[PDB]
Design a protein around this ligand. Structure first.
Ligand SMILES: COc1ccc2nc(C)c(O[C@@H]3C[C@H]4C(=O)N[C@]5(C(=O)NS(=O)(=O)C6(C)CC6)C[C@H]5/C=C\CCCCC[C@H](NC(=O)OC(C)(C)C)C(=O)N4C3)nc2c1
Ligand SMILES: [Zn+2]
Length: 197
């Protein structure tokens, strides 16, 4: 009992910058500082933007702020706290059945607005700041206009699918893979986030 370890916090280590005309990834914390912040849960770094790059000791993925909540996938975050300036913050939403978790959005982040356009021309944002056109094909699936090896999408779970006007349509969850090629993606629809709320 006395030696049982604690899992560390999820740590914001960068962001996907969408503020201007060029999308690009920014790193805001290196691997050593990430490891230390994960164990303490105390992250005093400035947060900006809608799409964060996040890490645990063993994985790296994305998280997206919608309606004042920073959302990501359960398969990346599990039940972990997130590091914050005052110490670890507990998830306010956890739904393993949806592969969904959420924490209160960090001070300084910006939130996306849920889409009400009813449009099926979407855009997936990856951890490399690629903006991938995706045609919506059902409630929780979309096809890539240009299929990509799954290598290209790995590490982008938790990222957004957006409509043409930049509203949030969903959270990227899984790639639909044939012979290692992603022809489609599965996502958590923003309406499911809204119901979880
Ligand atoms: C533990 O509790 C849970 C609860 C719910 C759950 N729901 C799940 C749906 C679930 O799927 C598993 C995780 C998820 C996954 O790899 N996502 C990311 C990603 O980038 N991840 S990540 O950032 O690298 C990482 C790994 C966090 C750091 C987006 C894709 C990028 C590339 C695809 C690589 C090859 C895997 C292809 C799987 N295709 C797949 O299953 O397709 C369907 C059509 C669904 C069969 C798939 O995509 N997969 C399996 N695992 C869970 C686990
Ligand atoms: Zn919209």
């Amino acid at each position: 009992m006395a030696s049982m370890k604690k899992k560390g916090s999820v740590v914001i280590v960068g962001r996907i910058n969408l503020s201007g005309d060029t999308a690009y990834a920014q790193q805001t914390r290196g691997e050593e500082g990430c490891q230390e912040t994960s164990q303490t849960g105390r992250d005093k770094n400035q947060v900006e933007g809608e799409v964060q790059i996040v890490s645990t000791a063993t994985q790296t993925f994305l998280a997206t702020s919608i309606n004042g909540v920073l959302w990501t996938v359960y398969h990346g975050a599990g039940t972990r706290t997130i590091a914050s300036p005052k110490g670890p913050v507990t998830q306010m939403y956890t739904n393993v059945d949806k592969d969904l978790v959420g924490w209160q959005a960090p001070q300084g982040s910006r939130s996306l607005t849920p889409c009400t356009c009813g449009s099926s021309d979407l855009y997936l944002v990856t951890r490399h700041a690629d903006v991938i056109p995706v045609r919506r094909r059902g409630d929780s699936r979309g096809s890539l206009l240009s299929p990509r090896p799954i290598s290209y999408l790995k590490g982008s779970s938790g990222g957004p699918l957006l409509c043409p006007a930049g509203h949030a349509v969903g959270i990227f969850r899984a790639a639909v893979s044939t012979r290692g090629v992603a022809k489609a993606v599965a996502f958590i629809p923003v309406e499911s986030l809204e119901t979880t709320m």
